[PDB]
Amino acid sequence: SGLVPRGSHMAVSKVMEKILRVSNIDKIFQTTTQEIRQLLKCDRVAVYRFNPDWSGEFVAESVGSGWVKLVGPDIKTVWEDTHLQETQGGRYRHQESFVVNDIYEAGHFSCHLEILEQFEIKAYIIVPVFAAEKLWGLLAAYQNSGTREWVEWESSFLTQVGLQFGIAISHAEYLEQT
Amino acid sequence: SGLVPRGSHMAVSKVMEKILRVSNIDKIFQTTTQEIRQLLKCDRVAVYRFNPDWSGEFVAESVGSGWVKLVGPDIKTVWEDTHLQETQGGRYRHQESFVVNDIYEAGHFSCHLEILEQFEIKAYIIVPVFAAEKLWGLLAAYQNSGTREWVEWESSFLTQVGLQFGIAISHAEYLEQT
């Protein structure tokens, strides 16, 4: 019997069309984080951009009602993570994605737990965004309402959109090139 | 622990870069069918294009040594399939993909089996290629050496490249638009 279209495949395909047709990458990030958050039924999806010193800030997001807005006019949410700085991007530098069903089961340090608790994160998936051969930032999906048993299609989907964001950034650089 | 890059994800991402940078869609089909065939370790990967009457022909392929070449200069391999014609594209019109581990276990008619046997096909995956809202053709992976227990990542991968071929064709149309 046939295999009908899958949500993740159709969402990734839609991102590709936007990259082909939309020059405003901010707008691609804003609409795409929204589409991802709807498909994953999670509480926040965010793009985090590294600074040269490996600190960074949230630059785009979609967030459900009842959770704090971390991106917007006259807001700048910075996270200067000393592990990511010391290691120049952690495992993400090696193009690894990471899946955490329960932040209390991951062996995080308490100062890291504190920040996760501040953003009300209970479970997450984090993937790399590479532009050219450099780690440019991270794309993350968060569950704030409770723990979550993420499945393979969900982590693969988020990884694939991270690749597409990377291509979007790279292509914009290429086009300019004036 | 981290999830390292997956072959299918990196291959789909490479196709997207080609679509952004390469105007020659023939060339995208030829190099991409080769990449797919290597990753799937199968014997033939082919793009089949429909004519207005729902007959069609193979327009690009990668094929292993020892199997017949069906695409090339001064060759035209047509398959006029009466089921696909009568139904205007079969299940593929509804954007369904199809996975067959063993052609003898699928309930095919003997005249269909005959053609499959002519091309030495034992097992296959077939996916749609849509350009705009129209079924433009099919992208197929074939095992000729024996039956094959295809797995989910393989069918998802082929489906995703079918979507990307569709976007490639659509975008080329859009750009012309002169």
Ligand SMILES: CCC1=C(C)/C(=C/C2=NC(=C\c3[nH]c(/C=C4\NC(=O)[C@H](C)[C@H]4CC)c(C)c3CCC(=O)O)/C(CCC(=O)O)=C2C)NC1=O
């Ligand atoms: C996309 C936004 C985002 C960021 C930036 C983030 C940071 C972050 N901090 C990490 C680890 C870490 N972070 C810290 C430490 C600290 N962290 C601090 O903010 C303090 C300044 C300092 C206290 C000393 C340490 C010690 C680790 C490694 C141990 C652990 O996993 O907690 C990890 C590693 C998890 C892994 O891949 O194993 C991430 C992803 N998570 C996110 O979702």
Ligand SMILES: CCC1=C(C)/C(=C/C2=NC(=C\c3[nH]c(/C=C4\NC(=O)[C@H](C)[C@H]4CC)c(C)c3CCC(=O)O)/C(CCC(=O)O)=C2C)NC1=O
């Ligand atoms: C990409 C290249 C390619 C093509 C075109 C192809 C054709 C093809 N013929 C099909 C069915 C069919 N084809 C035919 C009949 C015929 N077929 C003929 O070539 C004769 C003219 C005629 C004899 C009457 C019939 C009766 C069916 C439906 C029953 C069956 O599954 O065999 C199906 C349906 C399988 C499904 O989705 O269930 C396909 C995909 N397979 C491929 O890999």
